[PDB]
From Swiss-Prot, chain A:
Coiled coil: none annotated. This is Vacuolar protein sorting-associated protein 35. Keywords: Cytoplasm, Endosome, Membrane, Phosphoprotein, Protein transport, Transport. Belongs to the VPS35 family. Its main location: cytoplasm. The keyword Signal does not apply. Detected in striatum (at protein level). Ubiquitous. Highly expressed in fat tissue, testis, brain, kidney, thymus, liver and pancreas, and at lower levels in heart, intestine and skeletal muscle. Detected in oocytes, pre-implantation embryos and at 6.5-12.5 dpc. It comes from the Eukaryota. The keyword Protein transport applies. GO terms for cellular component: cytoplasm; cytosol; dopaminergic synapse; early endosome; endosome; endosome membrane; glutamatergic synapse; late endosome. Component of the heterotrimeric retromer cargo-selective complex (CSC), also described as vacuolar protein sorting subcomplex (VPS) formed by VPS26 (VPS26A or VPS26B), VPS29 and VPS35. The CSC has a highly elongated structure with VPS26 and VPS29 binding independently at opposite distal ends of VPS35 as central platform. The CSC is believed to associate with variable sorting nexins to form functionally distinct retromer complex variants. GO terms for biological process: endocytic recycling; lysosome organization; mitochondrial fragmentation involved in apoptotic process; mitochondrion to lysosome vesicle-mediated transport; modulation of chemical synaptic transmission; negative regulation of gene expression; negative regulation of inflammatory response; negative regulation of late endosome to lysosome transport. It is found in: Cytoplasm; Membrane; Endosome; Early endosome.
From Swiss-Prot, chains C, D:
Pfam families: Metallophos_2 (PF12850). Keywords: Acetylation, Cytoplasm, Endosome, Membrane, Metal-binding, Protein transport, Transport, Zinc. GO terms for biological process: endocytic recycling; Golgi to vacuole transport; protein transport; retrograde transport, endosome to Golgi. This is Vacuolar protein sorting-associated protein 29. GO terms for cellular component: cytosol; endosome membrane; retromer complex; retromer, cargo-selective complex. Component of the commander complex consisting of the CCC subcomplex and the retriever subcomplex. Component of the heterotrimeric retriever complex formed by VPS26C, VPS29 and VPS35L; within the complex interacts with VPS35L. Component of the heterotrimeric retromer cargo-selective complex (CSC), also described as vacuolar protein sorting subcomplex (VPS) formed by VPS26 (VPS26A or VPS26B), VPS29 and VPS35. The CSC has a highly elongated structure with VPS26 and VPS29 binding independently at opposite distal ends of VPS35 as central platform. PANTHER family: VACUOLAR SORTING PROTEIN VPS29. Component of the commander complex that is essential for endosomal recycling of transmembrane cargos; the commander complex is composed of the CCC subcomplex and the retriever subcomplex. Component of the retriever complex, which is a heterotrimeric complex related to retromer cargo-selective complex (CSC) and essential for retromer-independent retrieval and recycling of numerous cargos such as integrin alpha-5/beta-1 (ITGA5:ITGB1). Component of the retromer cargo-selective complex (CSC). CDD domains: MPP_Vps29. It comes from Mus musculus (Mouse). The modification N6-acetyllysine is found at K50. GO terms for molecular function: metal ion binding. InterPro entries: Calcineurin-like_PHP_lpxH (IPR024654), Metallo-depent_PP-like (IPR029052), Phosphodiesterase_MJ0936/Vps29 (IPR000979), Vps29 (IPR028661).
Amino acid sequence: FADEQSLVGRFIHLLRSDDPDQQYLILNTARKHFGAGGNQRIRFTLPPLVFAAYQLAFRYKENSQMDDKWEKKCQKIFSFAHQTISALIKAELAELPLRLFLQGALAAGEIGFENHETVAYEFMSQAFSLYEDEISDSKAQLAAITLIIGTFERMKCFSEENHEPLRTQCALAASKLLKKPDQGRAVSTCAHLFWRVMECLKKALKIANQCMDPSLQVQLFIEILNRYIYFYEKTIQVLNQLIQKIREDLPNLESSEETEQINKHFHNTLEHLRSR
Amino acid sequence: DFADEQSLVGRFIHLLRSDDPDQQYLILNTARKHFGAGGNQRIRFTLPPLVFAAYQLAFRYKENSQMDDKWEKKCQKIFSFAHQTISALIKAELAELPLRLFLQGALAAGEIGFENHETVAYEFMSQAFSLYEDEISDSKAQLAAITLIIGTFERMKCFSEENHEPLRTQCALAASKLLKKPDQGRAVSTCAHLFWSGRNTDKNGEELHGGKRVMECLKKALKIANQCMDPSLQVQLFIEILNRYIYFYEKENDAVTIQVLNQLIQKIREDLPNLESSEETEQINKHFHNTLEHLRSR
Amino acid sequence: MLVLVLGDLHIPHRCNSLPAKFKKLLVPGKIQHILCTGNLCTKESYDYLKTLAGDVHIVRGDFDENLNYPEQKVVTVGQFKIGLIHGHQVIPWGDMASLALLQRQFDVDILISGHTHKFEAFEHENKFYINPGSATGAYNALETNIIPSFVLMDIQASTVVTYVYQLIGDDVKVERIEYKKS
Amino acid sequence: MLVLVLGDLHIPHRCNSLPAKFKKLLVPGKIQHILCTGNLCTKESYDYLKTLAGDVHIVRGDFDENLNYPEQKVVTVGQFKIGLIHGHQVIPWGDMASLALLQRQFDVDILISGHTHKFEAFEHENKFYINPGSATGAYNALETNIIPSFVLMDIQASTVVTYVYQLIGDDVKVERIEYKKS
């Protein structure tokens, strides 16, 4: 149960062991009397057991110097973890086991055990299993995939011949955001996922020529005027003539509570974009 | 009607070519003012032949590759003027047909081998992905456009690395955009050729050798083979999968194996018997039965 | 049965018509059945072959103005079962096992192709496959030196004879390779 | 107004609660307004702060069980206008001009952040921006050596004073940097 899950946190804590395997066999006693709990009890106990197995893999990463099997015992965790994540895939949970897989991507990533990232790419595929075809809600689509983009911002661990297919497949998954401001904000960060580039912002410009809310695409233009700063400075004409377009469009919109604050944005962005 | 000026221009297609290429281009434009200032569907009937003339004028510029010198720039002059007149055929209620003229404008880009036409063809690829995407919904014409573009992307060898890989996937949007699964999955199945046979210029004329994603598209082809809700075609897709399991394995694609063949051929000692007995399945049997002769086992 | 097959006329979209030696050698009335693969782009391109015979059948190419053409249609006269397709859905053009395995899908024996604008034909896996090329000399991306050639063929019983007339340059080069249907 | 801000409690999803020195230093009743950025995952994590004060306001994080939390909400008491956000929609975490330009979009002065689990705060473009970190010591991908620290702050009139208590190891390191609101 839920209070049991907090006490599973106590079972993580008062019933850990510095030997990770003695913790693991009692994690298997936590599989015995407690991981044989049900479908909602194992919804309650197993992700902390996975968080235990996270920490057990981190205890194996704390056994990086005193143990030699700890990478394989991170993997002896990992497959057992993955099936325990799959034991929640069997337990009608796919949305939350994304995140544990997303952590299992990073648990493969941050530890770097043997064959970690292909299974994490399989976890990326498992993320693309557990995200890309079950979420029809656009908000739960967005905050998943943008965090997935946010983790793919942190997934530079993939080499440049393995980075691009998920880099397209998230941009594939960024297309499923049924509203274009959900798309383009992901798409703008998809342009940030490359590090060509600026055309994806012209795609985001084209996304901003597809939006229904006219100040919001100008807020997206503001975001474009935010986004035309970064990989520029890290494309040599657009800013002040579009600052002229904010001398243009921010007049020819609502002079509203957002947009006069966006005037107060723009005036203070005039304080910003006067880089002086 | 206005279709008089097909062969009438087609006669002048011959009767233009005897002159020098700019008096050709002059009396192109005077016929673009005598008769090609004819209307909106009249210019649909003369200007793509004038573009076909400009295609031959671009090929006269390639026939004046040693006669003239600025024939490359004269191509650049007329390719803008092509694209202009293709834009003047974009305004002629035509976006589906001027794809192909843009496609040939992309195919006659890379064929002459002169300057600047590739990004013009990429601008034409932008024009391809202008003139295709929003102007279509019929899944038959959606495919046959995009697979022709896929078929064009077989032969888009003039594209470099930064040009080939976005349009590797930019079509794979439109390949997957099709609301019917099979043709989309067949389009996806054609995209498996593009990861196998993607021609780029920085590899010294050779292809990209991108074999780390090809079988995965075949599992994606197997994935769309579970969304079709048409089982005799899905096993025909499985046959097409097996056809492509025939195809890639017998053409140096090292990622596929003999095991799934001798799985899927043995699947269809059941899955092909898992069909309603009619003109399809026993011919699909005699597909497989003679594919067993292709396997050197029958 | 003396039957004349053609393909890719491109009237008037790439090139005009047959050469003067060809319409000389292709007189009306001598043909029983006429098969056009695609790329006729007009209506008179069907009526020009309708002067030649009464059995003229065209499927849809890609440059076609007509939308009424079905894509595939199985036809049979005598002992031979043929299908007709233009060739633009062949991605790419020239695989050895593609035509051997597309044939057995519908259980035919003799295949006629097009859209590649290059003469190439041989025997493979108890079947004979034919690509005549471009009849009016239309351009392909793969072949720049376009040679137009027409092919008249004869079916009597389970054994075919062909007569390809290669107009390499301006002279008729007649070639012939036997085949017997199993 | 002595107000205590926190964030990323992760109860009990990553770590348990505050250290024993912290709940010693954070007695109930002393706080006027309580702002929690996100990651409380439960209900008693709100009631534990509801023992501390009556003005407790939480917006939605990403690990949150609650769906009732609005994302952004402008609040003001006295001379200061604050918004509260967790920080998971900050892609990535640490741009110099992102927080200077998100502030002027809604015309606020003082921003409180989270989700990055790292203490970092300074003054930029007439505004002061605050990232306390992880209060219960939860893990971030960017920071492995997680140091928990709490921040109690004071507003009297248009000039703030802060007291960050760095628990680097086990000892309280009190730091303080002035700021005056324009």
